[PDB]
Amino acid sequence: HHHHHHMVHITLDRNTANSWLIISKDRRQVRMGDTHQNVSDNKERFSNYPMVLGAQRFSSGKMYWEVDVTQKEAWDLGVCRDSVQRKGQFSLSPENGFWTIWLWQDSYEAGTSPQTTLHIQVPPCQIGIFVDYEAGVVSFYNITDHGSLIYTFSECVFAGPLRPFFNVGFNYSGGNAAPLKLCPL
Numbered sequence: 001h002h003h004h005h006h007m008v009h010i011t012l013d014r015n016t017a018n019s020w021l022i023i024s025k026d027r028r029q030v031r032m033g034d035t036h037q038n039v040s041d042n043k044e045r046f047s048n049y050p051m052v053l054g055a056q057r058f059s060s061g062k063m064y065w066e067v068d069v070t071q072k073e074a075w076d077l078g079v080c081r082d083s084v085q086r087k088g089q090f091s092l093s094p095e096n097g098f099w100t101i102w103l104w105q106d107s108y109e110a111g112t113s114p115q116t117t118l119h120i121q122v123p124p125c126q127i128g129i130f131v132d133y134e135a136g137v138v139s140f141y142n143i144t145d146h147g148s149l150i151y152t153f154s155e156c157v158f159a160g161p162l163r164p165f166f167n168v169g170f171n172y173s174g175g176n177a178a179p180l181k182l183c184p185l
């Protein structure tokens with residue numbers, strides 16, 4: 001792809017994080033701790049899942065960033081509306097304000113409703129995410145496989161400001177402790 005010149009510097013918003021997440025000093029990495037991280041509760045925190053938002057809000061333009069997913073077994077990545085539900089159970093879908101892909105149980109899927117099987121020959125270690133606000137597009141790229149396309153959401157109805165979205169996944173297996181990391185420009 002040729003989206004690299006739209007690169008934006010994303011940082012994580014501590015205030016939105018589930019209470020078990022640990023965000024690095026530079027706000028560029030996040031991992032799920034094995035206990036509550038001793039923060040107060042607030043209406044912004046995702047309560048039921050190990051999720052966090054980027055601090056940046058996008059309402060126009062073209063934006064690109066990259067995320068390192070090395071040695072993880074489960075994660076979700078993409079964008080979401082600023083006003084998505086934080087508390088209780090919900091599905092990741094465009095109806096609920098999410099444009100995401102995931103890894104789960106050795107398969108990759110897009111967060112449509114119902115979910116869509118992805119076709120990935122080279123398991124990615126870094127994911128590129130491109131948003132074209134005006135066009136209504138969210139695309140995902142396999143940086144490990146020379147930038148090959150993973151998935152495009154088109155005809156998106158964002159209906160609000162967008163925020164970068166992350167889920168580090170649970171670590172029931174003991175094989176999913178590694179962080180998500182925002183890769184340097």
Ligand SMILES: CCCn1c(NC(=O)CC)nc2ccccc21
Nearest residue numbers: 018019020047048049050170171
């Ligand atoms: C993994 C054990 C701790 N735990 C549970 N346990 C439950 O399943 C209670 C409904 N939910 C969490 C949601 C976010 C972070 C930690 C959570």
